[PDB]
Design a protein around this ligand. Structure first.
Ligand SMILES: Nc1ncnc2c1ncn2[C@@H]1O[C@H](COP(=O)(O)OP(=O)(O)OP(O)(O)=S)[C@@H](O)[C@H]1O
Ligand SMILES: Nc1ncnc2c1ncn2[C@@H]1O[C@H](COP(=O)(O)OP(=O)(O)OP(O)(O)=S)[C@@H](O)[C@H]1O
Ligand SMILES: Nc1ncnc2c1ncn2[C@@H]1O[C@H](COP(=O)(O)OP(=O)(O)OP(O)(O)=S)[C@@H](O)[C@H]1O
Ligand SMILES: Nc1ncnc2c1ncn2[C@@H]1O[C@H](COP(=O)(O)OP(=O)(O)O)[C@@H](O)[C@H]1O
Lengths: 177, 7, 349, 345, 164
């Protein structure tokens, strides 16, 4: 279903001035979904994970690519923020909340949510700067995010409960930007 | 509450 | 209700301290007058009765910290023994000034009306002082800044302390009538005072040369201490103005050490006698040995605390093998034993 | 029962080689520590004082070894912290109270039992006032730590979060402290002062100094004033009246440490070989060669493991696969690497 | 269970061009892990605690050796760094983050460090800070680590933990 030729043209309609970047996203997007079509069934073992790392100046269209891609793509999309993220959830937020918002977009569809896309803005915010230290936005956030990005099942109460049960939604399948 | 660290 | 007198309280402190008549007189008058200001709880014609804190200055190991400890025993009103190295300026990671008040309530059982009339002691006050002059471009958080915070505390104010660890409530405790005794050991104060008073010069022809004939650091370079001298050392006028009284302690003399070994009830020799008694061997110290220890102690220039090194090292070999030995009625230490030329004499049964 | 000083010395003797004066100090100190707990408050004498220990010696002399081996037979709570981490209060580095934290963990959060424990401090030389330093500066790393420790050694109460917004007060007067560390350049300081007193002119007399190195005997003549020039504060030295001088390991000390201790590498390696059913023997020729190499390299006893590991690095590869080998013999050539060790069938 | 000859073959399957390095890790890992099995039953008590040091040019697979070995033996492994240090507690908890619950299972894990030359003593608070601090870490100790972040602290021995 994914097409790298057409997707580049589609992004051109909404984005201009970044031709090389469109080629990179089309390959990773196509490869990631192709992997899930036949999961770990090929002869090649230890297949490299397909992820995306957007790096560009201000006003370059980073937030724009996430919006245009969401409209064109059929799977649900989410737009989170790293500034709100905090470690051990004191008063700010928790990493697991990112999965809760994804289900709201997918209407509590685990089969449809695992094939979703994730985009985190202001990645530099979580940069570890602990020279003079506890730190709630530094190492703690990156450590929790790395655990999630590695691929692990996290408990998420579906609908919040009327039960004491949680669903083990996978994470290795979901993509991250 | 908050954190203080300097020299 | 007959309160004690200075002559009576001095007799108690004299049992634990020797050769500090100048400093012991200050503590007696303050403790004596502290009860008078307490009795007149806004019941006297003279409103806002003045306060007079104390500043105990002395060399290392002279007994400053010991005076406050023994004082608390015979004292009925509460007391505390805090420090200043752990104090930080206005909310830093180290500690806050309100921690001092929290300790006082632990001793008084969170009795506000009973804690306001208590006494407070602080140690190593000299350490928190900017060595540099007034500019201090870098904002030191443990220097003179700490002194500035204490101004409101010494003058009198109210702080916030949670009760027994917690409510969302705090306790207000006045400090108008709370006394403070900040005692510390100042190093290099003799050199600063010499420049101001001696004003010695010996290069030119007209100027006179002292030739190392000036008074000793403790003999005459501490008694005539004035606020202006402390400014060069790094203290702030505002901090010294809150502490008008000053107590100068002289360095322990050769004769003073001899009395300290025998007269105090907690003397080191007495402690060894009790410790040796547990083993079952009596301990006797010869008079020749005691004076010899005093000569060695002064060379160390470590004060009374240095005495333990001389006694312990001298008798270390004896204590090592004494438990194994049996039926040893007495142990005596000779003058040569202090030097180490000869071993101590033991008696068997 | 209570162990006697002679009784505890023989225990340390197995794990400690070449240190006679140091064993006497820790034995008398620990033995006295017990009496102060029992005799205290039940004897005519009151307000029993305290006496700490100050270990001084070259690197790799066995200072850290004494702190661990002593805890085995003592059974009272023991801990081990580093001074270097400590910094003056209000700074990013660390605080002095931290040291107390570790002690509680070793006593299972027992305040009544933690006060009766023992503490050891390593790398104490790293905190000394820098005589040659700019006047307007603050040595929070070196001077601040010493100032903050003064009240701690004397005895006081410090706020401690239980189990790591409430705190627990824990007395410290009864707690013991054993500070130790290597002091580089101290030998020259002490040498100067004891031999300083002579001029250069004709009339001035000349001393006969520099007769011997006296490395093991010069540290024994240490005094508090010598440490002031080094950087220590006089107040800090007063808190540590007792002193201990540990000399450098002898030429043949390594040989004894290889065989006499129960925890020596020779016995440890034999255990690895013994479980496989192969006996391990080290000849005198092989062991002496290792000692010469260790001292020639100047690494010390700590580096001794490298020589043994490399000598058996190639040989150990095939011992498990090999069979019908009841005994193995180590030769001097094997340590040198000239020839491989012979296999006994 | 494995042997130096079998581990060498497995090591060669994923690593090449380093023959001497294979023999070093095989005996060290086999001996180190052997200590965990025997424990203190043998006469030679207080055995083990042999560290491994690797010095080589960048891109030689030093990190790959640890990761490949961890997969071959199915033992938890973490990859910490010393350049960040100016904390020590971060290193200990890091390993626990693999499973978040380990009492007698994380003690047998392995750790790798990169850029060890950075901490070299310049002659200078940037250097020599770490080396004095790592002494107690290497010699073995126990550090408080909140399991999962949370209200009971966990103590984990470090002597058994091997360092590379
Ligand atoms: N590459 C682009 N091409 C065309 N218009 C752009 C582009 N980038 C930004 N704009 C314009 O700027 C508006 C906001 O762009 P953003 O994507 O939000 O900028 P941004 O820098 O990517 O945001 P950040 O840095 O990720 S928070 C868009 O609605 C466009 O009008
Ligand atoms: N006047 C004295 N009489 C008897 N013993 C004394 C006297 N002064 C000091 N000592 C001894 O010295 C020990 C320490 O006394 P301290 O009060 O700590 O001296 P110090 O000058 O306050 O030291 P600082 O202030 O902490 S630097 C006491 O426990 C006594 O054993
Ligand atoms: N004096 C000694 N007697 C016997 N074995 C020793 C001695 N010194 C070192 N060793 C051996 O070497 C090992 C390491 O000794 P250490 O205690 O680390 O020496 P060290 O002088 O304390 O080093 P530090 O504390 O870092 S300065 C011990 O476990 C022993 O196996
Ligand atoms: N012999 C090898 N076979 C396969 N990959 C290797 C080999 N040597 C190095 N690599 C590659 O190098 C990377 C690790 O490099 P590393 O050793 O960490 O460099 P540095 O030591 O500079 O950090 C791995 O991704 C690995 O694929």
């Amino acid at each position: 279903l994914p097409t790298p030729h057409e997707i580049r043209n589609h992004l051109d309609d909404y984005v201009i001035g970044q031709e090389q970047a469109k080629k990179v996203l089309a390959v990773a997007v196509y490869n990631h979904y192709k992997r899930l079509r036949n999961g770990d069934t090929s002869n090649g073992v230890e297949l490299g994970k397909s992820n995306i790392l957007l790096i560009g100046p201000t006003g370059s269209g980073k937030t724009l690519l996430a919006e245009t891609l969401a409209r064109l793509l059929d799977v649900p999309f989410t737009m989170a923020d790293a500034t709100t993220l905090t470690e051990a959830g004191y008063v700010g937020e928790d990493v697991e909340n990112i999965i809760q918002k994804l289900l709201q977009k997918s209407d509590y569809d685990v089969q449809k949510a695992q094939r979703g896309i994730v985009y985190i803005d202001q990645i530099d915010k979580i940069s570890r700067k602990s020279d003079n230290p506890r730190d709630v936005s530094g190492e703690g956030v990156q450590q929790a995010l790395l655990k999630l990005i590695e691929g692990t099942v996290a408990a998420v109460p579906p609908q919040g409960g009327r039960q004491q049960e949680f669903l083990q939604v996978d994470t290795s399948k979901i993509l991250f930007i | 509450x908050x954190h203080x660290x300097x020299x | 209700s007959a309160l004690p007198t200075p002559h009576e309280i001095r007799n108690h402190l004299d049992d634990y301290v020797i050769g500090q008549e100048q400093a012991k007189k200050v503590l007696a008058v303050a403790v004596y007058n502290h009860y008078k200001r307490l009795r007149n709880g806004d019941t006297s014609n003279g409103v806002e009765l003045g306060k007079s804190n104390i500043l105990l200055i002395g060399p290392t190991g002279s007994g400053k910290t010991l005076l406050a400890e023994t004082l608390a025993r015979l004292l009925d009103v509460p007391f505390t023994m805090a420090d200043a190295t752990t104090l930080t300026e206005a909310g830093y990671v180290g500690e806050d000034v309100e921690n001092i008040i929290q300790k006082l309530l632990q001793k008084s059982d969170y009795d506000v009306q009973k804690a306001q009339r208590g006494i407070v002691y602080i140690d190593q006050i000299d350490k928190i002082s900017r060595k540099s002059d007034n500019p201090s471009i870098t904002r030191d958080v443990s220097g003179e800044g700490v002194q500035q915070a204490l101004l409101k505390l010494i003058e009198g104010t109210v702080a916030a302390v949670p009760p027994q660890g917690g409510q969302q409530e705090f306790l207000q405790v006045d400090t108008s009538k709370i006394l403070f005794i900040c005692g510390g050991a100042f190093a290099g104060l003799d050199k600063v005072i010499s420049h101001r008073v001696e004003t010695g010069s010996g290069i030119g022809f007209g100027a006179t040369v002292k030739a190392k004939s000036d008074k000793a650091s403790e003999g005459e370079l501490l008694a005539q201490v004035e606020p202006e001298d402390l400014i060069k050392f790094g203290l702030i006028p505002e901090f010294i103005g809150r502490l008008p009284v000053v107590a100068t302690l002289n360095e322990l003399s050769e004769e003073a050490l001899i009395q300290i070994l025998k007269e105090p009830k907690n003397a080191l020799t007495k402690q060894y006698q009790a410790l040796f008694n547990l083993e079952g061997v009596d301990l006797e110290f010869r008079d020749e040995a005691l004076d010899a220890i005093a000569k060695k102690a002064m060379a160390r220039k470590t004060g009374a605390r240095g005495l333990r090194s001389i006694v312990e090292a001298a008798l270390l070999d004896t204590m090592y093998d004494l438990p194994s030995m049996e039926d040893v009625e007495k142990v005596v230490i000779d003058e040569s034993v202090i030097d180490g030329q000869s071993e101590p004499l033991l008696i068997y049964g």
